[PDB]
Point group: C5
Chain length 274, copies 5
């Protein structure tokens, strides 16, 4: 089994779409392994850039195809480098960009602590043919940065495991477990914008809804309550465009439901009084 | 006729757009068949990855093109593997991602029970040239998962049938029936978000619309009724962006129509009283 | 002139964007012609699938490029088949998907009767080099189906004509007329959704606007009339997102204008009374 | 210098996005020049279609790359034809589709008179190596047509000029001026939809805002004025989605500002009266 | 180390999306270096256009791959020219178009002064193999232009630095520093549209909110205050669609918060008075 040393450098993390539950990671991947010795022209190592790499693969060079498990669509791979050394070591450099997905729960939606997970795996070579030696993840550009509305905390966790694929067991009986690399980056959402845009004005709405019981009337009090109902509907307008359609309720959703319940409680209270 | 054994592994199902009536399925497809024996270098089977596969096809290797019938656009095929064995068996591995479409009725829109259908078929080889032996669908990653707002129930149904194409009968008189694989995954929509976002607040609107007949007046009662009309129009705003434009009416649509009818009934009632 | 028999099979028609005045047609195209006899290996016809077709074109095989005249962008061509027969006949099978455009008038917008037109034409071969023998259009999948909000009525009309190109007359003086195939599918819009979503509620708005003259007041009547004005503006909100920006007025637009005129007529009437 | 005769045929002009200030032009381009005589098989001219053209370029054939200067993104080039004649003349036919951009001022926004400009230029050959002889633009399909909301007036202007590039002066000292073709099509916007959708209802709003001074009250007059303020805000909602963010003000924008000023003038007037 | 002289010509800067914090730069890049002397056919320099360039790279020609560091996605590279001179000098011309990103702070959002940064760097060659001699940036087309809503001030700053990559230190111990070119264009936002669209009408809202204390009542004053609350919510609707979700507050956001605070201050003031 060929031992492959991966070095994932995260250039930037952007495009975090909470509705689609996806994010875009740009960076470079450096895979290194030792193969058969070769006689390159000159004692210096020879560098193969994009396209010229194929001629070498048609000649018979072994280059693994390292795919991303949790990618959405084909990754937008840019330039590729294949640096071949006389001794035998091969260094494969490539720039990747793709949309990655995660579970991404939203129980505490303004105060999310989500993990950006990159899963890397060979497409066709199992651990009896290709083993991952180690990975160092260099998240130096975004180690402590306020990317989008997200705070990156700490370093990036690295993990190497074996994944058994039961769909490949019928075609490959004894050898179907694949070496997988998991790269986890813990991210904390910045809650400031939601704090001054949603929670505080809806709190003012709740206070104004409490303030309707100071009238010595019944009809214009009803019109006031339905004006507040229209205002709460207005606040529920641009609520579903910031978080996905979740079966559970979040803080903004419970505040909207509390506003609806407060208005309807005022309605039933004045109807019971009448 | 070459017998081809397919093994569709569904990695994830996502992007279920109810307006477009489409969904995105990501996964791998494993086609296996036995051909002529060949002398690979070494007794071990030889693995061909993306691109190097073509050289083999130019040499004269028979590799079928398994298309998706119900796909929207070209599928975003990633890496491909062609694992050739000395004996003769050929294993074709490929990763697919495309937008698939189904009939997808919405009679009970918050309580949908839709089927995600994948149809697989050879493009050019009929059942006199290529027959599908069997398919095992491995939906283990999403067997019981809350993907998007959808619940996957049970396993995946497998079916192999023959499809007669009458447009190919004029060019191929006696041999125009094609072997087709249908993969059905039954999905149940999670109704919780709609339950606390649409039905309950519109029920409060209906209760408030009932509550207008407690006024001893005529003009401000009219202004109250038109304020409620504006509120129901506001609720009809973000109604057409969650389900497609259907000839029939659904539960949210009947609740909106009931609100409109209740307000107009109040209008005609107070006009008849005056 | 080579006689080419086309057989267009319409798999589905979807994505009918009335704002862009475009629609998406998916299906297969079967072109058949007789060329020089050839000695294929074996008496059976030889099938060339995607990619391997080019090698044959580099060898010198004559394969026409049948383009779509009214397409928007490049068509998303999937798999291609080239079935070569010993005798000489060549059958060209290809799967096409593209956005097509038509004139698509909207005088009676909820009750549209539009035609989906597919125009097929060789790119480089005129009728002195390539003539279209006949076309049979097999619209069997959508012969009577409720696709989107559209009803497909009857069969598909077929037509073969010669198109003179005056821009090619300066470079080709005597031979610049091209054989063109026009495929027309008559479609009827389903008016039910608009009937229960726009016409009926706006009729209720018109009735409520008539109902303002029952007040014995002047100021709160004015406030009622401007509340109705705000409601009509709300109904004009999600009006321009369902049909394109047309110089003429349609039924929804005339209903909105009638609502505006009714409110302003009420305003001028009460001002004249005062 | 090789004299190249261009013949641009405009099939259609569509997708005029005023916000992006871009438009989509579909059509064919016919470039013709005379080169070295060649012995084609047979006295008839030989036609090279897409792909087979490259083999000829690898053989050493001189085919210029005619780029579009004002294009947005890569043009969506479809089929290409290279018609080679025994004598020597070469005719290059290609179908282009791309997003083009212009200055596109909006001083009189409902009554725009904009020019659709296509700029064509060789990428690498200057006028010491490639000169444009003439261009005839055949805008016969859209000579007098109501495309989108735009009226095409007259024919298309043709112009051939030399463009000096100062960025190529350091690498090419004496020869850096390039022959450029400018194709201008004058377009007039159809003002009918805006006339019955924006100007007339906002005029009714202005009349109703004038009508507030008929009340013998102060509080409900204030509530009426703020209802009209909410209506003008509603009309300012779907105002910024039809024209881009311009430093200057247009007719719809001045009408909105006049409505705001009229309401605030009413407010200050009644406050001064009180 | 090969000295490479770059000449970046900025054709246009457009598509400045403040929400995505990205912008689109179109233009041409001219890289020039001196290599081994060659015997071209004829004393004149030989021009290689797109595609034919590869044959030369397969022959063994050294052409660097100059990537963009801050690009979003793959750049939409169009035509490429490789002009080879007898002496030895090679001129590489290419047209690039891609989405670039910057830090792009928005402390003074209507009065932004942002920098459009283009970072250019070889993908595989370090400064021991490729050194950047100089860069001249020719921003002559947009030197003083009102592109979008942005004013370009002055010329473009040029900078050449060495970037040490610590992720390449494990694979290349002593040689991992790369020559980088930074091109900065200072841009000033045009504040006119925001000045007459947001600040002035919200100032009128603030004045009207001050004007509520002129009523001798309590209930209709409350209804007036909640009508103003609904108007401020309406103004907060189309506020989050022009600037991204920032942790800090900007001028429009502070004006919205001031309106909310003024209305709630009026509410608490009249409640304290009652």
């Amino acid at each position: 089994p060929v031992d492959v040393s991966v070095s994932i450098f995260i250039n930037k993390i952007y495009g975090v779409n909470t509705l689609e539950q996806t994010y875009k990671v740009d960076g470079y991947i450096v895979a290194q392994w030792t193969g058969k010795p070769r006689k390159t022209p000159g004692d210096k190592p020879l560098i193969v850039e994009n396209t010229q790499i194929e001629r070498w693969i048609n000649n018979g060079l072994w280059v693994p195809a390292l795919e991303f498990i949790n990618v959405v669509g084909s990754p937008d791979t840019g330039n590729k480098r294949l640096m071949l050394f006389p001794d035998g070591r091969v260094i494969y450099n490539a720039r990747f960009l793709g949309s990655f997905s995660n579970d991404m729960d939203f129980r505490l939606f303004p105060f999310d602590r989500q993990q950006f997970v990159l899963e890397l795996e060979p497409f066709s070579y199992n651990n009896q043919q290709l083993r991952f030696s180690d990975i160092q993840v260099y998240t130096e550009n975004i180690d402590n940065e306020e990317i989008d509305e997200w705070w990156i905390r700490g370093k990036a966790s690295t993990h190497i495991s074996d994944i058994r694929y039961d769909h490949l067991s019928s075609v490959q009986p004894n050898q179907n477990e694949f070496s997988r690399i998991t790269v986890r980056i813990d991210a904390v959402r910045n809650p400031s914008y939601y704090l001054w845009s949603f929670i505080l004005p809806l709190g003012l709405i709740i206070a104004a809804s409490w303030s309707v019981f100071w009238l010595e009337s019944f009809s214009e009090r009803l019109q006031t309550s339905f004006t507040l109902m229209l205002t709460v509907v207005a606040y529920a307008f641009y609520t579903s465009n910031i978080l996905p359609r979740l079966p559970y309720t979040t803080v903004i959703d419970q505040m909207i439901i509390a506003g609806y319940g407060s208005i309807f409680a005022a309605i039933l209270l004045i109807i019971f009084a009448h």
